[PDB]
Amino acid sequence: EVKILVDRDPIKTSFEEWAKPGHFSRTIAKGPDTTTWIWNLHADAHDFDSHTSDLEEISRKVFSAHFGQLSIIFLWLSGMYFHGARFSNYEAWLSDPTHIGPSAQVVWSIVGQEILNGDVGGGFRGIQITSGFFQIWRASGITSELQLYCTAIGGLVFAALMLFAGWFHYHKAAPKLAWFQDVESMLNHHLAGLLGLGSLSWAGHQVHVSLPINQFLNAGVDPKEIPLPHEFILNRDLLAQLYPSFAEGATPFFTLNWSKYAEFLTFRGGLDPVTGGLWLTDIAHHHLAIAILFLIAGHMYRTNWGIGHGIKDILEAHKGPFTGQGHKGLYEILTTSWHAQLSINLAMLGSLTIVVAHHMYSMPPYPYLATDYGTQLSLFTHHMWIGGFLIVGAAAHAAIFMVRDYDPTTRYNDLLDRVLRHRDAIISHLNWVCIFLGFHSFGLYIHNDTMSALGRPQDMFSDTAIQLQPVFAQWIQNTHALAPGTTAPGATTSTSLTWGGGDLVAVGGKVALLPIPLGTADFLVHHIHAFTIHVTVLILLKGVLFARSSRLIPDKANLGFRFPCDGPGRGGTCQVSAWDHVFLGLFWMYNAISVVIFHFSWKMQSDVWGSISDQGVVTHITGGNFAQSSITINGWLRDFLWAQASQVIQSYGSSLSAYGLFFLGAHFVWAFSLMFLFSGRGYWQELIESIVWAHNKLKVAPATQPRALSIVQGRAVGVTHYLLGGIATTWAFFLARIIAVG
């Protein structure tokens, strides 16, 4: 049954294992013969599945690593809060949020870097931050710095607690294998306890603390005159003056006449005119409903009592038209190996992050967030990159599982075998789809370029010559615009202002949100996005499916997961492992994310963001040139890359100069990556031979004989440098432009 099972003092804490490096692997622990040993010592550090074979030790190591990661995260949060408390202009920004730029870092005065202390505003000099922490603090109700200091101290305490917990659970009382293999209890506790209770407590905080303070702030009261948050709890008269429903107490809740709470639990939707964000009452209502839903859903699986559901029974008793017996042995596979769970969770987290970025840019949930353009751009790009990286890692872990943890004798599944028995058709169809999509999507642009270069503007695919309009998206937009009139009588207005139809919202002379039009350019860019996504999916799926064996190599599983090749024979067998497939798909993920962020940036600058005069006219940043210049590659190169790079290259001698320096440095790194992607090991080894001879002549020969990097190491270095350089270039360009112009 469900029980607590632990082992007492499995390991003894001592420094004897710190002295000798590479104690986990005997081959590494033997000693360094050449330099390659060092490069191995860091590669196999976290491969717990290769150190031993028992599941118990692997699970304990995973638990301790999770605790350490939590401690590091808590330390980072405490540091951020302390910086916000001490070196910041939060109190000055609180009174005048529109005319003051947030800043939470101060640079020293050693070399001459004091030029980096720009005039952000409010009698302060420092670096303007784009993390969006000030909006979070304002929405939480913080109006002083003592609270931030207390939060930092609490974060430090919690980080220390997490570190101690990790040490205790590895070296003092380590749970047994049966403890980890209880998925029903874990699911119940994660659904009902971790998610429902936390959201319920946050809803309670919002009801009791955030709403009154934010109402006082929105009224126009000075932040230094607002009553302290505990005064609202202590004094019921203040809350009665603010919200009369509280005068009735908690009696309505048990009386089921919940309408009395309609004052601070509303369903209006839309954006708040004063701050350009969502209503806080709607947020509290949503959190309460989510808490109820999670608390109800957390009691589904049978643990220690008669009532409940069994996951294995649900999987086995599943019957359907296309499935059949299907999911019979999936429970053992999922409860036996960590890699399948890691892949599933990685893919889900990446998809959730992308959805989070979309929902966050579409409907701003924080006050004074829509009118701060740099924060929005940074959040969108950062979340998109994180989601892409996680989605990439999921496939690599799936391939690792398929390579080293799959055996069809002891643990056999029908669906996996059926999929593995017809992989050729899947690969062929995906290849054809990718070819067709790429041909059409890029041929449209090439045709537009050629027709425009020949003095034939009437033959292009544009809104004036040959129109390809997204009719389905326009229909969906119209339906969403007309939704609250008849389909959703509860809501006063639509969920978002993006849908075509409604009014414009602007805060403090700057546009917050307005409906986004859709035309031929959106059609073309959407098809390009689909093409890139399909190619990445094709690469990753081909890597995953052909991991065990192939027509060219019938015994690829014996060589392992990380091997360079099989030999010069068969015409050439370079890059046949799944690791090479992941290393190749990284490039396409980078390409797709870069295209997506470029599209988002240009469209938002051209059609949404801008300024409003007193008369009522709206002037956008780039004056709406997206619909006519983004249909050709020359337009993308000239009106986006050339025009918007004026700020970054002219930032020398100002407070933004650092960005400009990065705009150069990243470039260098990118070029450096090419050295590791175009060459091979033999040339470098032969050069190191002569260098070693020259060293030997002067009696400076080291015992550890120098060796050139392995092929896999070179590929990893090249791809890492490429990605870092590209991402840093985009980061510097985006930040410089959006800070200098917005």
């Binding site: 024979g569 068969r570 015409g571």
Partner: protein
């Protein structure tokens, strides 16, 4: 068909014969070593060129050498 050659520095450890994926090499009795055997490559036409035999050979330089040569259906690893 590629060309596989064996030199007299071989010590008869039988690693190359075990490493071959297409059954090209075998062992024959010999006279000039402690192991009293030496490798040979009769089935040369079945060689693909993977060079696993060279990968598994303890010597200052390999006693088994593979030189790529005229390609055919068998040496190209084609199943269609």
């Amino acid at each position: 068909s590629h060309s596989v050659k064996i030199y007299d520095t071989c010590i008869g450890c039988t690693q190359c014969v075990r490493a071959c994926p297409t059954d090209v090499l075998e062992m024959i009795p010999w006279d000039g070593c402690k192991a009293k055997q030496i490798a040979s490559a009769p089935r040369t036409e079945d060689c693909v060129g993977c060079k696993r035999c060279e990968s598994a050979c303890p010597t200052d330089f390999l006693s088994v050498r593979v030189y790529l040569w005229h390609e055919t259906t068998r040496s190209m690893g084609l199943a269609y």
